[PDB]
Amino acid sequence: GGSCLGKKLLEAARAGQDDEVRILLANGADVNTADETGFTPLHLAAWEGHLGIVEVLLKNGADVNANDERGHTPLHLAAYTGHLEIVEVLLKNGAGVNATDVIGTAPLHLAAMWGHLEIVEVLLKNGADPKAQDKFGKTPKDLAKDNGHEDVAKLIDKKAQEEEEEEEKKKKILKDLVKKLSSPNENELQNALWTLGNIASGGNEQIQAVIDAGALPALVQLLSSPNEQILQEALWALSNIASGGNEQIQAVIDAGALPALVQLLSSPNEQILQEALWALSNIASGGNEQIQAVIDAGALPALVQLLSSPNEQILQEALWALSNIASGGNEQIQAVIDAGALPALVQLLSSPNEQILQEALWALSNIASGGNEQIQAVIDAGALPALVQLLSSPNEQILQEALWALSNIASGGNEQIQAVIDAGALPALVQLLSSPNEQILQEALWALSNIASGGNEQIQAVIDAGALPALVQLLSSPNEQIQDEAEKTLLNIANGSEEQQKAVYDAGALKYLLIIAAKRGFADRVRLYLRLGADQNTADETGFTPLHLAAWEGHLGIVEVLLKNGADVNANDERGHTPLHLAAYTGHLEIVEVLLKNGAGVNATDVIGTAPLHLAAMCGHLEIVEVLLKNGADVNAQDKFGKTPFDLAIDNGNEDIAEVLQKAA
């Protein structure tokens, strides 16, 4: 792997060697790479028309809908050329048939710009919008007119005409099904009632079609039906509508459904009660004002009263509904607190039912996501002792939800953070930093970082819990998100007193923090760790130094800062590679010059006798080859396989580099 590996893929596709494309991926690297014009090897392969390249590029796992600087997709390039048997291979594996660029045109906008035949047949079968125009204002049917070719434009307007007919047949059927919701025949009513609800179970656009047909007022009136079977199916339909976007939720609200749903919370029929809770929970998944409409309808006292229900299944639904309400802003969260939910929620944390336990943890987690006085209300209700006890639960999902609730509480002020510490949470949190579950690892790491962002007393309690050795050890985790959050935690701890800052460095963190900063790219953090005493020449078990990393990643600023602090310019890893090797292989010209300026060995050979000229000549880095020769690179050096840099440029097809080498020899 390397920036050398995915170098000629870009021009192998633009040329058209199935073989060279094949060997460029054979070892395994980046299937879709970068480009000056944001392109990928899939784009140029479909532009030139090499079918043997677009198919091999996706069977290994790439991306069919890659965008450039203008938004062009492989489908957009497969339609400008007119290649059919290259279009459907993209349509087969999920490609944007209506993908939009910065121009606004579509593949069928440009398929009719040149007037292409059979490629329009397959995009229309896959649902290509012919009615959506670009930003110029000329539809695909219109661009075929201006081109002077009305061959497939007739097929464009028929599909558009058939699209207009089918959308009006749907509106005709939907309106008649809504009419049948008023039928005195209950069989005809339920047949229409189930049909509409089933349609409303589909996508968000099918929900809008049911709304646009005027079904909501009839469904709300059916909520007072004496037929409980009709009432249940009407609840099911409204619940399906309320599962869509916020606009569809608001239409259910504006239809006056909430007062009927609140009243249905007192139903003795537990199936109807479960459906009403279903509908209210979906409405409370909306925005803050839609959650408030549920509150203003008086749903909270019934929900809090449902928390004492003997039916454990109904109890899970009421918890689900309360959890969504508490997902709103502080005004909505405070309404749940004022309704008296916290005493019942804390009591439910002692339930032997693990499913009720998770649903109760969710509600507390969202209530604890509010302001400091809302968090304090959770603390005052006695949730912390139960939450800490749940950290020793064998169920990893209950453990993950308890960590989430503790993280939300620890996001408040120092008084709330100190309450978490006083409940004995830090030992369990520090112990969970050794969990094999990586999701539990991050959740415990999130909680510690919020605690570590408190006062010096809260920082000191984190240190006294033995967090520093485990946090330092997490800096070497393969997960970079864990490295970053453990870095943030150690930075918050370092922002305390000078003694606390010294304890982070006596734990040996500067060695691994410098390694992280050398890979990420921001040089001021590299300056920070160096200034604070990080050894610039410390190598890994592989012998990789910070100067190796930035040269491999291409961070010129970090490379210069490290060299200014006495970094060994010719440091070797266990393979004999110097930073000059890594920069000449990845193709970073400026870094190669800076290293040579600071005395990097131009003719250093690794274990297998590879010199930097071998890597640059192998990878097509023409400018780097020229720079190496200026500094006295040996043109006649041979690796252990008897290959000169001129030989490697020939075995890779880099004729421009081969010409320079054969005459510089």
Partner: peptide, 10 residues
């Protein structure tokens, strides 16, 4: 600080 809210549709 890190105040995360979670919604669930059904």
């Amino acid at each position: 600080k890190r105040k995360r809210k979670r919604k669930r549709k059904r």
